[PDB]
Amino acid sequence: NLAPLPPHVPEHLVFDFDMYNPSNLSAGVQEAWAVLQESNVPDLVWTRCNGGHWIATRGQLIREAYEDYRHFSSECPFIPREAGEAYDFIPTSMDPPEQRQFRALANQVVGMPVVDKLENRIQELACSLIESLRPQGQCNFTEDYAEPFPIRIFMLLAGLPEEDIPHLGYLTDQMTRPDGSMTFAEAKEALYDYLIPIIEQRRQKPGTDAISIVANGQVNGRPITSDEAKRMCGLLLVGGLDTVVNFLSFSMEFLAKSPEHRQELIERPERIPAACEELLRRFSLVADGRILTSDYEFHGVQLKKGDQILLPQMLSGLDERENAAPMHVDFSRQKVSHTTFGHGSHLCAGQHLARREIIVTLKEWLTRIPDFSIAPGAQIQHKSGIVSGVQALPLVWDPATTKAV
Ligand code: HEM
Ligand SMILES: CC1(C)[C@@H]2CC[C@@]1(C)C(=O)C2
Ligand SMILES: [K+]
Ligand SMILES: [K+]
């Protein structure tokens, strides 16, 4: 279902990539996006899929565009257009300098000092979930660990009841990987209708949870509005529920297939932080973008005002111009170059939380269950969208080779 080619786009720049269903998905989602980096494809192309939009395919262009918010605005950062237009999360729907005072409040609530404060709980929950699974000799990693570990920590941080998880998980899925049951607008409104009473309750009687802090914070000398707090909390929910969850499945699926990579981390745990970076590169999973604020010529290509451009955070680290043998996982890379948490002013606010969750998962899983694999015959399906993911991940192991700590 292609949209008619706009008159300003030359035919040689056409490449009909569908970000929500790439043709190569059976081979792995990162591999499916990497077709955009074969020699037949220009640096910057127009797809007629999903309403019609640009895609930058090279790390250099993606970084440049994310830096230049003057031409590439966050006002409409999602494809398709209806989703980008409905999208009003704070601070991600704002350009500098407006984004600034909000970014600082996001940092207050999900930044380093909060992570450092919650580290014990993070550690506690990983060990608990893992020990609980360990003697089973099998699990569905997506539902058995990948979801509850990051999500319960986020609900803990936000002071929200775990009973609300399935509902919230549904709405977030719809926003990043639309199935078609509901528009982005409807999904957002459902999410906001959940947030609205909570925020109100918390402006009246402040707590110490992230939502209380946001809803009672200050921006530009004045109190945050109930509407702004809602737009900010909505983003935090999305980030909390649908990023690390999906990334953990990619990493664990990989580790299920490489005993030598496992042993590398088991023998020298100080390598785990670098390994985290490398897995973040190889299994990068986000792709949003920007909208053109005016007519602009960018690397020889005529862009028109209102044109959307997808700037896949996923592609920069897979670009062979940034990393040699990009599809190989090499914990010893002298520089892991990537933009997995993004680039420019909107560089992920929760990246420290995410790394902590990944680093804890790697160490605690490999300690107790050093030897595991994918269930025999099992076929792993990836899904693609604004955030790519794993449908299911059946793992198996012999409990005789596992360890309680
Ligand atoms: C592996 C995990 C994660 C990845 C790959 C990721 C990716 C990203 C990316 C690419 C952006 C920039 C989007 C843009 O430029 O439009 C972003 C922004 C953001 N993320 Fe993350 N994220 C992760 C985890 C989290 C978590 C756990 C949170 C917790 C709340 C979070 C909260 C945020 C927030 C608040 C922003 C907005 C920053 C701003 O606009 O100033 N992220 N993330
Ligand atoms: C693109 C993102 C990963 C980033 C954090 C959540 C997300 C879906 C957003 O809307 C901003
Ligand atoms: K290309
Ligand atoms: K918008």
Side-chain angles (χ1 to χ4, degrees):
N1 219 279
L2 302 317
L5 183 66
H8 69 287
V9 183
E11 303 164 282
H12 72 255
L13 291 181
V14 175
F15 185 88
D16 297 315
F17 185 83
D18 180 356
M19 65 167 291
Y20 289 112
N21 186 37
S23 304
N24 244 84
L25 200 48
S26 52
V29 65
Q30 291 76 16
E31 289 83 350
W33 283 71
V35 303
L36 281 158
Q37 302 175 323
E38 317 282 358
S39 62
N40 58 306
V41 192
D43 291 347
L44 174 54
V45 296
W46 177 271
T47 181
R48 290 175 293 188
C49 301
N50 298 303
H53 62 87
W54 301 98
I55 316 179
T57 71
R58 292 295 173 193
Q60 177 186 230
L61 277 68
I62 294 166
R63 289 193 166 76
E64 239 190 296
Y66 277 128
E67 281 175 38
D68 183 6
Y69 58 87
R70 212 91 45 170
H71 293 106
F72 302 102
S73 168
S74 289
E75 184 181 7
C76 185
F78 273 26
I79 274 134
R81 193 176 297 276
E82 314 81 70
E85 289 183 0
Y87 184 101
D88 65 354
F89 288 151
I90 292 171
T92 53
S93 69
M94 286 160 177
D95 298 316
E98 185 194 17
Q99 176 230 9
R100 203 210 92 247
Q101 283 222 29
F102 297 97
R103 183 168 168 79
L105 182 57
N107 190 252
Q108 292 187 27
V109 306
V110 298
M112 266 181 64
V114 162
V115 180
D116 286 328
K117 187 190 63 62
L118 282 193
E119 182 126 347
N120 287 331
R121 307 309 304 274
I122 300 177
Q123 180 74 359
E124 181 192 29
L125 182 63
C127 295
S128 189
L129 261 1
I130 298 173
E131 178 57 26
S132 180
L133 292 183
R134 175 187 67 82
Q136 284 176 17
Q138 59 176 101
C139 73
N140 186 345
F141 184 82
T142 60
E143 65 179 322
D144 290 345
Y145 183 91
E147 293 170 11
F149 167 66
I151 300 174
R152 289 171 191 178
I153 290 176
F154 179 86
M155 305 295 271
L156 171 63
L157 167 58
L160 296 174
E162 301 192 351
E163 303 83 70
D164 299 341
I165 290 167
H167 173 61
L168 300 172
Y170 179 78
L171 299 180
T172 300
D173 286 347
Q174 287 308 309
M175 283 179 278
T176 55
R177 290 170 306 281
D179 120 86
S181 72
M182 57 193 312
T183 58
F184 185 92
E186 291 181 322
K188 193 190 55 175
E189 282 312 310
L191 168 60
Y192 282 169
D193 283 351
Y194 169 85
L195 287 179
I196 284 164
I198 307 176
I199 285 154
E200 188 121 290
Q201 293 178 321
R202 258 110 120 151
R203 299 187 78 196
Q204 300 175 295
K205 301 187 185 182
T208 48
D209 60 288
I211 289 167
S212 298
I213 308 307
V214 169
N216 282 294
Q218 270 212 138
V219 290
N220 193 255
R222 52 92 186 176
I224 189 171
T225 71
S226 277
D227 179 65
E228 289 162 335
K230 175 203 67 183
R231 300 205 270 140
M232 208 170 326
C233 285
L235 175 69
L236 297 173
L237 272 270
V238 169
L241 268 43
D242 198 58
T243 57
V244 182
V245 166
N246 300 289
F247 176 74
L248 289 175
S249 300
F250 291 124
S251 302
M252 200 56 55
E253 175 186 16
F254 176 71
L255 294 173
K257 279 132 60 169
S258 187
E260 305 85 349
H261 285 80
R262 304 200 293 254
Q263 284 308 131
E264 263 188 89
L265 301 187
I266 293 167
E267 294 161 42
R268 334 216 77 117
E270 74 276 16
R271 295 230 199 130
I272 288 171
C276 168
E277 289 312 289
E278 167 73 344
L279 292 169
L280 280 169
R281 182 197 66 79
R282 174 60 176 80
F283 303 108
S284 193
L285 75 165
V286 178
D288 71 343
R290 301 296 188 258
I291 188 163
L292 275 294
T293 52
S294 75
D295 289 352
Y296 182 46
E297 175 178 294
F298 185 64
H299 294 246
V301 179
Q302 286 300 324
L303 307 178
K304 282 229 176 166
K305 176 174 192 184
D307 279 357
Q308 300 184 264
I309 180 170
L310 185 63
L311 303 163
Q313 281 89 349
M314 178 203 295
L315 289 182
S316 310
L318 301 181
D319 193 343
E320 81 271 21
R321 297 175 196 178
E322 294 206 351
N323 299 276
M327 301 307 282
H328 175 42
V329 169
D330 183 352
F331 294 156
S332 73
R333 280 179 195 271
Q334 290 294 2
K335 176 179 178 201
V336 182
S337 173
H338 70 78
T339 60
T340 290
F341 289 112
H343 192 66
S345 62
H346 288 280
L347 183 56
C348 174
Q351 59 181 323
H352 314 111
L353 176 55
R355 290 189 172 90
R356 205 62 232 167
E357 290 175 343
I358 298 155
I359 289 167
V360 167
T361 298
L362 291 172
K363 197 190 173 213
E364 299 315 320
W365 187 282
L366 291 170
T367 294
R368 295 170 177 74
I369 309 171
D371 200 84
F372 61 94
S373 54
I374 296 186
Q379 296 281 21
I380 309 308
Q381 302 189 36
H382 291 167
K383 284 226 306 128
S384 185
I386 302 277
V387 169
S388 292
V390 175
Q391 184 124 119
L393 188 63
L395 308 175
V396 299
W397 58 91
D398 180 2
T401 69
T402 76
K403 224 213 310 213
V405 185

